[PDB]
Amino acid sequence: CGAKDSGSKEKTSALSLSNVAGVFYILVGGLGLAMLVALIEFCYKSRA
Amino acid sequence: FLTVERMVSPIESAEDLSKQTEIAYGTLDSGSTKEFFRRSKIAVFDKMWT
Ligand SMILES: N[C@@H](CCC(=O)O)C(=O)O
Question: Of the residues A33, B29, B47, B48, which has the maximum number of CB atoms within 10 A of its CB?
């Protein structure tokens, strides 16, 4: 068996990344969506 | 954090002494505890005696 939680304890400590990891996913999704919107707008406005 | 102030000891499990080296530990000389560590074959206790 290998659960074996020991050593430094986050419970006595900060928020881990796993507690706010959703915000980073939303942020990178928004960045990708913004680049995609800019690319489709440029594709529309170009070739003429 | 500035409301609740839990302490937590660094050697809670009583086995961490066998892995850590920053905390020294010993027993009374010429006593039952020293002989217990000297003779016990339990792996963790063997580590402590070593
Ligand atoms: N002093 C006794 C018992 C250990 C103790 O002090 O608790 C002995 O030498 O074995």
Answer: B48
> Is the distance from the beta carbon of residue B26 to the nearest atom of ligand 1 less than 6 Å?
no
Structure determined via: cryo-EM
Which residue numbers of B belong to the known binding site?
Answer: 32-33
Rounded Cα gap, residues B49 and B47, in angstroms: 5
Distance CA B27, CA B25 (A): 7
Q: Given CB atoms, is B28 within the 8 Å cutoff of chain A?
A: no
- B30 min Cα distance to partner chain A (Å): 33
Please give the resolution of this entry in Å, rounded to 1 decimal. Answer: 4.8
Q: Which residues contact A17 (CB under 8 A, 6 or more apart)?
A: A24
Tokens 């003429």 locate to A48
